[PDB]
Every structure is written in structure tokens, then in C-alpha cells.
């Protein structure tokens, strides 16, 4: 007795669902993969020459498969009805009111997907929740399925967290450090788990596939994300200590990271981490711990967010202090709005928070990013936006007549700008605030040109 997945439906065509299913289709030519979404313009973009997200290599993966065994559709109902495997990869926004307001994930879209699946399903199907931050997701799906049975309907629920990082999604999906699958410790659960393993074994060695139960799967993802965020907050805390004592956080990070028990990754100090994963993940971990009467664990992990918030505030107040605490009507260029390089995603970007701190001081911001759409920047910063915010088409326009240049995202193009040209047209003193350490090694040239260079973790 086993189950072979021949048709996959993925509900959610976002940063998780789109790339993941495109790689599955690419690696499994005999499996039909249909990605569905309520958002019609997003589906139309997936079917166009201009994809709705920017991921290096994604266009090539999509175009090698689309229309052969990879499909993007708004017909959610028919995709479910015919699927052997249904992924749920939707967003779980933070509650904006009620218990856990601003902290706890809202499961309403997961629950609506589960209800929609029952409505449109007959026979046997595997339903797998796949997200970067699963918060009681498998349990809520099972609760709906347990309460809404039909004769001969047999739905299995798996957890399959997604470990990809945006901007490296395709490389991460093709060579994952591990694949994590959680399922019930019953004959039915193990048959479903094996079926999903067989999909991944088309390109992932078996020794890199971990199998467990659904809760251990979700807790492992929640903890792993928090460990990553903690490394960043830890090295950022050291960056403040370096600034206060004359050390350089990049040199300290190198010495730390050469301990093979620590490792040398995720030790790059920055204005602060962003993205839809880390802050949401730690907030939900803290909230969960409070609900379980584990306040010591809750306040332990809360420090990861408190440190990130302090790192952002400290960076902004250095900018304001350098401008002698009045920035009313001063032009300031913001270079980089995405939460990291090589994506157009801005969710929880530090650039949003730095911009708002400067807007509260009356700065006239000119914002340039090579990939973030103009309209997204307007939405993220929302009358005050109308008065203070300009979206520049190129970085020289943003810097023309500026008092300060603030680098918030580590796009490689920023280290190659014509900084002699930028200096000529800035007001003096002309400041560069490197919130990403991308201008390291240009410091002598920039000082010779005449800039005041300030960067995180060095004074």
C-alpha cells in the first residue's frame, strides 16, 4: 500500500509557492504542477515574460517548464479536485487587533484553504502546509478536516517547511541543506510522508531528507529561524560595542567566525534584519511561550527583536546627530529599499523604519532601489509621504543636492557608483552612512574625495 503523487496543486503563488513549485516541476518532468492564487494579476504575471517577483534564475526555471508540466491558474477549484498533493503556501499576517495583536499570526487564510479543500475534494489526497513560519498550521488544517468528513474522503496532513532565502531561492531549492517533512506516526501518515519524500528524491539525496511528526517539524522551523535571527542581533550588539570602543565589527566577526563550533555565516552586521520571516517568527515564538506559561523562554527570545529595534534606532539617530539634530527640509538619499539584495521584496525592510525616523524629523527623502516598484515604496511609507518622499529613477538624482547618502540595502551596484560625481553635487559636509558595510575598502578614496563616512560597527 502506497501513494504516488502525479499531480500537484499549490495554493499560493508567492515567494514560497511560485519558486518552490517551479523547481519541483523542473526536477520532476512526469509530475503535473499547477500553482493557483486568488490574485489574478499575480497569476497573469507568472504566465508573462515579466514574473511578479524578482529572483535570480527564476525566469529560466519557469520558462523551461511552463506549459509543459508547470501551470499558473486562477481556477483554484479544479486544481484541487484533480490534485494528488495540495500544498498550502499562503500568507499568515499578524493580527492587528484582539488577543496577541501585533504579535500572533492570523490563521484565517490557512483555515479558509482547508475548508475550500474539503469542499472540492473526493477520495484520497495529501495536503501539505509549506511556509517559512508555520504557526500551528498543521493542527488547524487537521481540525477542519477532522470535523468535515465525507464518505470516501481521506485527507492526510503533512508539514513541509520551506528553508529557502529570498534572492537565492533557486540555488537553495535545488541544493537544500535539508528537507523537513512532518507527518502522523500512523500507517496513513507514514504512507503520505513516503509519497512526499519520493517527490524530493528526484533531486535531493535521501540522507538530506528528515522525517518527523508535524509539530516537531513546525517547532524545528520556528527555532531554526530564531537561531538565524539571533546570530544577526548578536553581531549587531557587538557592532555597538565596537563603535563605543574603537574596534571594527568586521574584524571581530572574522575572529569569532573562525571558531568552527560557531561557523562564519550570518555574522554580517547591518542596520537590522528585515523580511517576512524573522521578526514574525520570533514574535510568534515569544507569544507561544507566553501561552505555555514559559515566560523565561519568552523574554529570552524577545531580546532578538529588541536588539534589532535598537540597532535601527541607533543608526537613525547617528544620521540625525551628524546633521546636528535638525533635518527639516534637508534632502537625504536613501539607497536601497528591499530588505536584502537581489529581491524586490520590502516586507519589514529596515529601509522602511529608517525612512520613517527621518520623515519624523522632516527630511526630504529621495529613494532609489533597482528592483522595488515605485508604488510599493509609496505604500510602505504611508500626506507626510506627499510632502517628504520622492522616488528617484537613478541614484545620482537621489544624491543631487543631498546632505547625506544612506545605504540600507547591500545591492552590489552601490559600490560601483561614481562617488566623485556624487560629491560634486552634494551639499557639504556630505555624509555617507553605510548601513551594510558595502563600501569597505573604498574608505580612503571616499575620504580623499571629501566625504564624511560613517558605517555600522566602526568609528
Annotated binding-site ranges: 12-17, 37, 42, 90-94, 131-133, 162-166, 221-225, 261, 268-274, 277-280, 339-340, 347, 436
Residue 227 touches which of a second copy, ligand UDX, none (Cβ within 5-8 Å per kind): a second copy
CA 279-160-94 angle, to 5 degrees, is 30
277 is catalytic: yes
Give the span between the Cα atoms of 245 and 247, in whole angstroms. 6
Q: Closest distance between a second copy and the C-beta of residue 407, in Å?
A: 23
* Stretch of residues binding a second copy (CB under 8 A), selected from 44-52, 237-245, 275-283, 374-382: 237-245
Question: DSSP states of 352-419 as a string?
Answer: HHHHHHHHTTT-EEEEE-SSS-HHHHHHHH--HHHHHEEE-SSHHHHHTT-SEEEE-S--GGGGGS-H
C-alpha cell belonging to residue 401? 543636492
Interacting residue with a second copy among 32, 42, 130, 136 (CB under 8 A): 136
Q: Closest distance between a second copy and the C-beta of residue 269, in Å?
A: 12
- Which of 323, 304, 317, 273 has the alpha carbon at shortest distance from 430? 323
Give the span between the Cα atoms of 362 and 161, in whole angstroms. 43
Query: Can residue 444 be called a binding residue for a second copy (CB under 8 A)?
Result: no
113 is catalytic: no
Q: Closest distance between ligand UDX and the C-beta of residue 168, in Å?
A: 7
Neighbours of 386 (CB within 10 A): 8
Q: Closest distance between ligand UDX and the C-beta of residue 27, in Å?
A: 19
List residues bridging with 431 in a β-sheet: 404, 452
* Stretch of residues binding a second copy (CB under 8 A), selected from 48-56, 218-226, 388-396, 426-434: 218-226
Cβ 312 vs Cβ 346: under 8 Å: no
162 is catalytic: yes
Interacting residue with a second copy among 294, 379, 413, 427 (CB under 8 A): 294
Q: Which CB, 93 or 123, lies closer to ligand UDX?
A: 93
Residues binding ligand UDX (CB under 6 A) = 11-17, 37-39, 42, 89-92, 109, 112-113, 131-133, 162-166, 225, 228, 232, 266-268, 270, 273-278, 339-340
* Stretch of residues binding a second copy (CB under 8 A), selected from 272-280, 323-331, 375-383, 417-425: 323-331
- Which of 222, 209, 150, 153 has the alpha carbon at shortest distance from 183? 209
Interacting residue with a second copy among 237, 376, 390, 452 (CB under 8 A): 237
Give the span between the Cα atoms of 351 and 208, in whole angstroms. 36
Amino acid at each position: 500500500h502506497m501513494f504516488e503523487i502525479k499531480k500537484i496543486c499549490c495554493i499560493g503563488a508567492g515567494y514560497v509557492g511560485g519558486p518552490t513549485c517551479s523547481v519541483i516541476a523542473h526536477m520532476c518532468p512526469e509530475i503535473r504542477v499547477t500553482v493557483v492564487d486568488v490574485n489574478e494579476s499575480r497569476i497573469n504575471a507568472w504566465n508573462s515574460p515579466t514574473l511578479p517577483i524578482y529572483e535570480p534564475g527564476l525566469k529560466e526555471v519557469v520558462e523551461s517548464c511552463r506549459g509543459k508540466n508547470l501551470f499558473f491558474s486562477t481556477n483554484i477549484d479544479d486544481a484541487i479536485k484533480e490534485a494528488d498533493l495540495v500544498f498550502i503556501s499562503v500568507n499568515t499576517p499578524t493580527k492587528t487587533y484582539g488577543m496577541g495583536k501585533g504579535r500572533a499570526a492570523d490563521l484565517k487564510y490557512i483555515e479558509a484553504c482547508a475548508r475550500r479543500i474539503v469542499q472540492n475534494s473526493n477520495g484520497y489526497k495529501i495536503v501539505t502546509e509549506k511556509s517559512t513560519v508555520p504557526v500551528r498550521a498543521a493542527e488547524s488544517i487537521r481540525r477542519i478536516f477532522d470535523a468535515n468528513t465525507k464518505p470516501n474522503l481521506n485527507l492526510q496532513v503533512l508539514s513541509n517547511p520551506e528553508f529557502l532565502a529570498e534572492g537565492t531561492a533557486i540555488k537553495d531549492l535545488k541544493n537544500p541543506d535539508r528537507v523537513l517533512i512532518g507527518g502522523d506516526e500512523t500507517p496513513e501518515g507514514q504512507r503520505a510522508v513516503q509519497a512526499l519524500c519520493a517527490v524530493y528524491e528526484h533531486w535531493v539525496p535521501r540522507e538530506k531528507i528528515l522525517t518527523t511528526n508535524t509539530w516537531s517539524s513546525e517547532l524545528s522551523k520556528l527555532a531554526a529561524n530564531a537561531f538565524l535571527a539571533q546570530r544577526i542581533s548578536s553581531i549587531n550588539s557587538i557592532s555597538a560595542l565596537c563603535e563605543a570602543t574603537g574596534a571594527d565589527v568586521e574584524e571581530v566577526a572574522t575572529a569569532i567566525g573562525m571558531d568552527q563550533r560557531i561557523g562564519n555565516k550570518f555574522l554580517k552586521a547591518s542596520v537590522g534584519f528585515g523580511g517576512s520571516c524573522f521578526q514574525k517568527d520570533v514574535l510568534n515564538l515569544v507569544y507561544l511561550c507566553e501561552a505555555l506559561n514559559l515566560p523565561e523562554v519568552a523574554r529570552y527570545w524577545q531580546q532578538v527583536i529588541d536588539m534589532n529595534d535598537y540597532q535601527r534606532r541607533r543608526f537613525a539617530s547617528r544620521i540625525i546627530d551628524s546633521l546636528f539634530n535638525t533635518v527639516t527640509d534637508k534632502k537625504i538619499a536613501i539607497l536601497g529599499f528591499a530588505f536584502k539584495k537581489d529581491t524586490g521584496d520590502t516586507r519589514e525592510s529596515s529601509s522602511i523604519y529608517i525612512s520613517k525616523y527621518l520623515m519624523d524629523e522632516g527630511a526630504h527623502l529621495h529613494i532609489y532601489d533597482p528592483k522595488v516598484p515605485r508604488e510599493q515604496i509609496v505604500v510602505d511609507l504611508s500626506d507626510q509621504v506627499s510632502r517628504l518622499v520622492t522616488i528617484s529613477k537613478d541614484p545620482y538624482e537621489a544624491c543631487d543636492g543631498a546632505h547625506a547618502v544612506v545605504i540600507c540595502t547591500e545591492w552590489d551596484m552601490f559600490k560601483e557608483l561614481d562617488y566623485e560625481r556624487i560629491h560634486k553635487k552634494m551639499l557639504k559636509p556630505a555624509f555617507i552612512f553605510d548601513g551594510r558595510r558595502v563600501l569597505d575598502g573604498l574608505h580612503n578614496e571616499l575620504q580623499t574625495i571629501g566625504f564624511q563616512i560613517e558605517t555600522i560597527g566602526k568609528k
